[PDB]
Write a protein that binds this ligand. Structure first.
Ligand SMILES: NC(=O)c1ccc[n+]([C@@H]2O[C@H](COP(=O)([O-])OP(=O)(O)OC[C@H]3O[C@@H](n4cnc5c(N)ncnc54)[C@H](OP(=O)(O)O)[C@@H]3O)[C@@H](O)[C@H]2O)c1
Ligand SMILES: NC(=O)c1ccc[n+]([C@@H]2O[C@H](COP(=O)([O-])OP(=O)(O)OC[C@H]3O[C@@H](n4cnc5c(N)ncnc54)[C@H](OP(=O)(O)O)[C@@H]3O)[C@@H](O)[C@H]2O)c1
Lengths: 355, 355
């Protein structure tokens, strides 16, 4: 079978044996795999996450496929499934996997397929334990690779909202930092969230005309240009935000969100920045956190329950939105195009097979 | 009646009319009032919190008293009560008070008796609406002024634990930053907490011999000298902490706690520092928060439910502890002694009357 990978030393096509499902696993024929920032990181230089003893890493962690061999599992041929990303590390299972919370496992206690220590999903076929395969409605198969990123936000919201559960919290405004695939998906999710947000805002740093600015305004949200208005200045210009969702990977934002939050608000952090120091007014951060009962919660990955919730959220998203968000689905024959990234490309995917 | 106050321009005795209870209020005869850091701040220069049109501020927010006139409330003569601290601002009630969550009210939407905008409890008598008077067991009357500070921690724990409620969290280690009255009370509370902590730690910066170090070690906790081991170095020397409770008011601690927290841990911030900037590695803060699913939650004040929970916690605290924590209860005749603060004085109170 063909797979798209990065060899130790740009993405290329590689040939490898079709895997065979061990007991408890099913054989899945890949349909479409989304391309994400992490995939670009790898194609960049992030060759650390390579599997032990391997000279290549098959890419892709956002996938959807069809079950071709149920083997001894309770799945059925033809079921449309989306795989979870985390798997037990080389040293075997542990408490996080035992108790079914691998998304809470710390560094070194897991592998993430297509990201660290284990091959991804950009291959014609792949296998996975039945417990990590989530059945989704057949009609979501075409954009099924979007279930995983929607999963990410379902988890982040669950933890952020749980932090405000000891009192009567009724938010009205939400602010998403970042106009990438995750931030835009999240803005649309907040538009339909049961918390009933009235005013939505999204931070970016693009000049018009720009398709991300267009999606933001079509969702009826307010586009905030960080070059004109820093996060901490937002309350002066617009309003204090009950809920902030950080998806930029810019450290200043994690600190400054505290000044933009309304009293009793919570900020969910999803960005993954590298070390970077700078002068911060920590007394202001510290005091606002305390005197205004605020919270900052970090979240990474997600698990089965979030993928299931994602299928419901998916049906509520505007159809025009899903069309404008996915800028290109490319056949394997033209896979390289899926990795060209410019301001006008938002979410791309590679199509391996159909039906 | 006599009251202890600070006049615009050290604490002194002042004479004022005994108040009369309006409808819905009871008249309380003060028994004992604890002295706290805020009281010292006022005696320092914090004369901003003075009541409008008043040239003095009666001190004290940690009090216990006996009901002498139930007026038209459902309280009974002789009931032992502890008052809550927050009251509606001059501009009348608002949603926070309407819904019974004044502890969540933002700046400017409340007064705190003895702290900002309203007179405290260091007077022979005081009144208060029945809804803000919490009945406590008669036998807790002698150290009843401790219910309010215990209240503070009951609320902070409730919010911090609520932030970890979306997954199976089972902490084993807890770290209290600060060896003041609030930190020491909190360390004893964690010793008996239902979460079953196995290893307790407390941060201070005192040289032996010191009575705060003695309380820490008698509770079977480990004393950590911040001059020898900074918060961020703690995991190297001892272990990562599942739960951190910050009660130092030192901004570096709020930032550094993130590096000391174990994966999936939460830090509760209670300190109130002034503005102070400095170089921080925000990328390290940001990334650890996200990749290890951590949370930081701020908390201030507390309300009725927490004062009620405090009465149960009080009975579980070691008797030797309560004896060592309260370094002096001084009769009104010698009130000034209650404000002398040195390393060997931990918690003091002023006794206005008995029984
Ligand atoms: N914790 C998790 O589970 C998880 C999962 C997926 C992704 N993430 C992280 O989430 C972040 C967002 O990922 P994505 O897939 O949406 O990433 P992305 O495609 O890189 O998008 C980030 C977006 O934020 C914008 N941005 C960066 N700095 C900005 C600034 N100072 N002001 C305004 N906009 C700014 C970028 O704008 P320009 O294009 O104009 O530079 C870009 O559009 C990344 O850090 C990623 O690592 C975390
Ligand atoms: N949010 C709320 O509702 C609330 C309620 C009450 C109090 N607070 C705040 O909570 C904090 C603690 O108050 P308290 O009544 O316990 O205050 P406190 O009596 O001032 O005690 C703070 C303690 O922390 C220690 N400390 C300060 N910096 C330190 C450092 N770098 N390393 C080690 N120890 C350090 C001090 O040690 P030394 O004596 O050796 O300097 C002191 O013993 C204050 O900031 C107060 O404003 C908040």
């Amino acid at each position: 079978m063909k797979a798209i990978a990065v060899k130790r030393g740009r993405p290329v096509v590689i040939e490898k044996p079709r895997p065979e499902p061990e007991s408890g696993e099913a054989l899945v024929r890949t349909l479409r795999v989304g391309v994400d920032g992490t995939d670009h990181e790898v194609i960049a230089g992030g060759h650390g996450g390579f599997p032990e003893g391997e000279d290549h890493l098959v890419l892709g962690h956002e996938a959807v496929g069809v079950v071709v061999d149920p083997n001894d599992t309770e799945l059925e041929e033809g079921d449309i499934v989306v795989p979870t990303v985390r798997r037990p590390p080389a040293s075997g299972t542990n408490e996080y996997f035992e108790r079914d919370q691998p998304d809470m496992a710390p560094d070194g206690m897991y592998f993430e397929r297509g990201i660290v220590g284990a091959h991804g999903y950009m291959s014609e076929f792949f296998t996975s334990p039945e417990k990590y395969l989530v059945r989704i409605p057949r009609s979501q198969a075409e954009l099924g690779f979007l279930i995983e990123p929607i999963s990410i936000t379902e988890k982040a919201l669950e933890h952020a909202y749980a932090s405000r559960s000891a009192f009567d919290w009724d938010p009205s405004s939400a602010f998403v930092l970042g106009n990438g695939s995750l931030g835009l998906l999240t803005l649309a999710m907040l538009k339909v969230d049961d918390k009933g947000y009235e005013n939505l805002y999204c931070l970016g740093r693009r000049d018009r005309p720009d398709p991300t600015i267009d999606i933001i305004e079509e969702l009826d949200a307010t586009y905030v240009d960080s070059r004109q208005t820093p996060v901490e200045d937002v309350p002066d210009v617009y309003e204090q935000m009950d809920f902030i969702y950080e998806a930029t990977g810019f450290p200043k934002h994690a600190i400054q969100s505290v000044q933009a939050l309304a009293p009793n608000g919570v900020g969910a952090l999803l960005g993954v920045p590298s070390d970077w120091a700078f002068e911060v007014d920590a007394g202001a951060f510290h005091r606002e956190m305390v005197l205004h009962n605020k919270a900052l919660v970090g979240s990474v990955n997600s698990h089965v329950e979030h993928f299931e919730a994602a299928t419901v959220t998916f049906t509520k998203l505007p159809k025009w939105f899903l069309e404008d968000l996915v800028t290109g689905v490319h056949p394997l024959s033209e896979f390289e195009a899926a990795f060209d990234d410019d301001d006008t490309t938002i979410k791309t995917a590679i199509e391996f097979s159909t039906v």
